[PDB]
């Protein structure tokens, strides 16, 4: 059942892309409801995300944006299982991934991707761990592979055709995009791309100094398996032995085992021969979620429907047994893109939970004006057949999500006060003479002016004054033990508010360009005074 | 049941304060499911809202300010009757009040209110319907009077003490507000008589009329209260209304029929009292169901307690009979509550809400920032049942429930949309008409880029020199309900919804040389040489 009643909790977080919104939703899983909101590439008022100098700063040559498109959302794995420490997310909009830490529940690192105009998608190494991060994005197409842990792009690899989604094995040797202009696969030897860097057969472009790789077919680096017309999604199977890449304009599905990958990079086969199952399924196949028991669910965008179907029979079918392998077909309610099964994209997928997200809800909730939301639908798949559970509204069009065991996530309940995310602003304090944890003090800096302040339930600091038009900065340091004793700054009448949480230190920078005495309190009563 | 299956519907519309994500949330009820979120005060990434020029000219004087803490959603009513037309917001942050318009759902009006630097409680005039908004503010307090459809402020009353919430009658004829103590009653006759005779002053060169109602004053009569109320909740009936004394573990109730008489002399403002019943520690707000009963948050208890006013009111007369009927404990800090149809006449006893200002272990942990717990309860029954526990996002204050049969949203946007009649009269001076036009204007360093979208963009590329500032406006002409567009420029930071048949406009300078790409979100070529 997906009731999840007072006084029980959910068996999984769900982490959703928050499409054109540009944060990282959290959802408990199976209740659907949504716990928490992560900004990420949006101005957000709730936190002061992208207004505060310590989010400014991760945002780095990105401050300046007020949106993104924030979509395929990943968490960081260790030998293929999900760890709770990372996950990342790209936005679609302006060519950024960034990487929210699982402690804290925020975004530490955002990097612009160079040499590319837009990129498409992203997904993380599964094994031996997250060591990488890979995304798609054109200029032809470039695939990235990111450094997770400096989140830094460590190379780059140039291909023939347009790079729209990717994936990884579960061995550390190959990577795959699906790629058009038959269309094809192509496989990254993660072995040969770090021989061939590490030998300079790379060059740069403009100034900048991203080492980027011929992966054209020809290359060593890569092979190109062909596969029917524009292929979309590309799924990893959890046991490691086989990827599907989704047909769309084809009503197939290709499947291909990927022990007979290092005999494709040696010629020994040809790599049509990858191919062992190539099922009909229905119109507009695009993204495929697997169980643990050898099947297969891939949404039918133009029947909108999920075809649930065996993969050991596929295989069979292909070799002329009449067998069937389609199992069901499962109306969903409209257009659906993206599925998802719990724990799917790792060793430890279950088969409880199907999640799939559709574009249209037309009447499946009560109207809202001429903008509507999304539908998120729950399927169980514990059984032998689907049953739709449940239907989720959804706002702002997130493409993707994922669905990791709730044992895996282990968030702290304070901040600590050496967290590199406000380190600059205990530094610039240092400079002042500051100690945080005691001090209450109005440092004054030509027509800059620096106030710190702690507070307890209460600020330390009743009152300050400062110039008109001087270029104020506000740092408030939560000295609270007690989790969830979350406290607000705001400044009356300016625009300025931000979450200070227990332990963490936040500021904000404003001109004090209105005269007179100006109220600040506590909004999860001091005054300022400009002359 | 609480239980909406798929396929089901909701029975009722929840309108949500966002908190301090400064946006109005719908929900369905009794889902709990979110449906849309309204921008209101934030700036928000999936519609524009705040980047748009649309959006802009709606903010007015406050189109700089980027945060807002958006509380108190309230709907127009007709005769004490949700009537659907508008949800009335304001952010205490900044002392604004935002009207959102529920045919296309979405903020078409915003007014800072002058003369004050904070605005607490607002409410809207129930009976005969809902001509004015109220609410209260500080300098010293004022009660603000707005008039709902011209959103303007018609007038302010000065008083004495600090006014925090305020309710209104079912005639027309008064309005509350609990101040620090006492219970304010405005006489709206009064006021406006005071008015038309002239006795009132201004302030600080703008005009609005400000009226003396401190004690003493005709205006204004004092119903004094145990110390620090909070609530203050008028009954379904329109017979009483319900004080909240948080500091003192009482609820305080007025019959309103005797509010004449306090304000004739007859009697005194003390005989306005018909109970004074004891509940528990912290009682912050009140909700009525349709059979007599009230259900009062207590805050420091976390209970909701369940009491009949009938039997209250005997008590406070002598009688040996017990007025509280049930508590229920809540999880945990309870603050506002409010019931299915609440504050209207058509209250149906169906469904409780309770705002809890902490979760703690109610749902999974996510970091240092927690959730709120937003409790559903069934109150259908004799006993209040607690079904669901509603993770909520950015510590909302208030909400309010309404039955889906009174709010009837448009499907599509209209032409002749006042939202953008602005934008429809700088495309008529430029000689451009926005449903058959793709033109690029130019005007020194100034650049008007006006296209249609189907499906595709009417306009495949256009050219501009670097530092070009450059307007693009956007018409999207589907006519099929949710085929949604979107604007996108690359790498730019810039996005926006173009709802069918809407027309939306955002301006940006072109500061990066070369291609840059565009594309419906929900691809083009701009140049720059």
Request: proline residues 4%.
């Given at each position: 059942s997906a009731v999840v009643h007072p006084g029980e909790l959910d068996e999984y977080y769900g982490f959703w892309s928050g499409g054109h919104s540009g944060e990282v939703r959290i959802l408990g899983i199976p209740?659907?409801?949504?716990l928490m909101r992560i900004p990420v590439f949006n101005i957000d008022s709730a936190t002061g995300w992208g207004i505060t100098n310590e989010s400014k700063r991760i945002k780095g040559?990105?401050?300046?944006?007020?949106t993104g498109d924030s979509h395929h959302p990943h968490m960081s794995m260790t030998d293929g299982s999900y760890n709770g420490k990372y996950v990342f997310i790209n936005d679609k909009a302006n060519s950024r991934v960034a990487r929210i830490r699982?402690?804290?529940?925020?975004?530490?690192k955002m990097i612009t991707i160079p040499n590319v105009q837009a990129i498409h998608g992203l997904r993380v190494q599964k094994v031996p761990y997250t060591k990488y991060v890979i995304c798609n994005g054109e200029f032809r197409s470039l695939f990235n592979v990111i450094?997770?842990?400096?989140?830094?792009?460590?190379f780059q690899v140039m291909v023939d055709g347009n790079l729209d989604n990717t994936d990884a094995d579960y061995d550390g040797k190959y990577f795959f995009s699906t790629c058009y202009n038959r269309d094809h696969v192509v496989v990254f030897s993660l072995e040969r791309c770090l021989a061939a860097l590490k030998a300079g057969k790379f060059t740069n472009y403009n100034g900048n100094k991203v080492p980027v790789l011929d992966g054209r077919k020809?290359?060593?680096l890569t092979r190109y398996i062909p596969v029917p017309k524009s292929p979309h999604g590309i799924n990893t199977a959890p046991d490691g032995k086989y990827f599907v890449a989704n047909g769309k304009l084809s009503p197939t599905v290709s499947v291909v085992e990927i022990a007979r990958l290092d005999d494709v990079f040696s010629g020994k086969?040809?790599?049509?021969?990858?191919?062992v199952a190539e099922p009909e399924l229905g119109l507009g196949p695009l993204h495929t979620a697997f169980d643990n028991k050898g099947n297969a669910f891939t949404t039918l965008f133009l029947d909108s429907q999920i075809a649930k179907w065996n993969i050991q029979d596929a295989i069979k079918a292909y070799n002329?047994?009449?067998?069937?392998?389609l199992r069901q077909k499962l109306d969903v309610?409209?257009?659906?893109?993206h599925n998802h099964t719990s724990?799917?994209?790792?060793?430890?997928?279950?088969?409880k939970w199907l999640v799939v997200l559709c574009k249209f809800s037309k009447d499946r909730f009560l109207p809202v004006g001429p903008l509507r939301p999304e539908n998120d639908q729950l399927i169980d798949i514990s059984g032998d057949e689907m049953k739709l559970v449940h239907d989720g509204p959804t706002f702002a069009e997130p493409h993707d999500c994922m669905i990791v065991h709730r044992s895996k996530v282990k968030p702290q309940k304070l901040w600590t006060?050496?967290?590199?995310?406000?380190a600059d602003t205990v530094a610039m304090a240092k400079q002042d003479g500051?100690?945080?944890?005691m001090d209450n003090k109005v440092i004054r800096d030509g027509n800059k002016v620096r106030v710190y302040m702690t507070s307890i339930a209460?600020?330390?600091?009743n009152e300050f004054k400062v110039k008109l038009g001087d270029e104020v900065t506000v740092v408030v340091t939560n000295l609270d033990q007690?989790?969830?004793?979350t406290h607000g700054f705001c400044m009356t009448n300016h625009g300025v508010q931000m979450e200070v949480a227990p332990q963490a230190t936040a500021s904000v920078t404003f001109i004090a360009n209105k005269p007179g005495v100006q109220w600040y309190y506590c909004n999860w009563r001091g005054r300022m005074l400009v002359e």
């Open positions: 209740s659907m409801r949504e040559d990105s401050a300046h944006l007020m699982c402690d804290v529940m925020k975004t530490d450094d997770a842990e400096k989140m830094e792009v460590a020809g290359s060593d086969i040809q790599p049509r021969d990858a191919i002329g047994e009449k067998v069937n392998y309610h409209y257009q659906p893109g724990q799917g994209e790792t060793r430890d997928t279950d088969g006060r050496d967290d590199p995310m406000f500051v100690t945080l944890e209460n600020f330390g600091m007690v989790e969830d004793v």
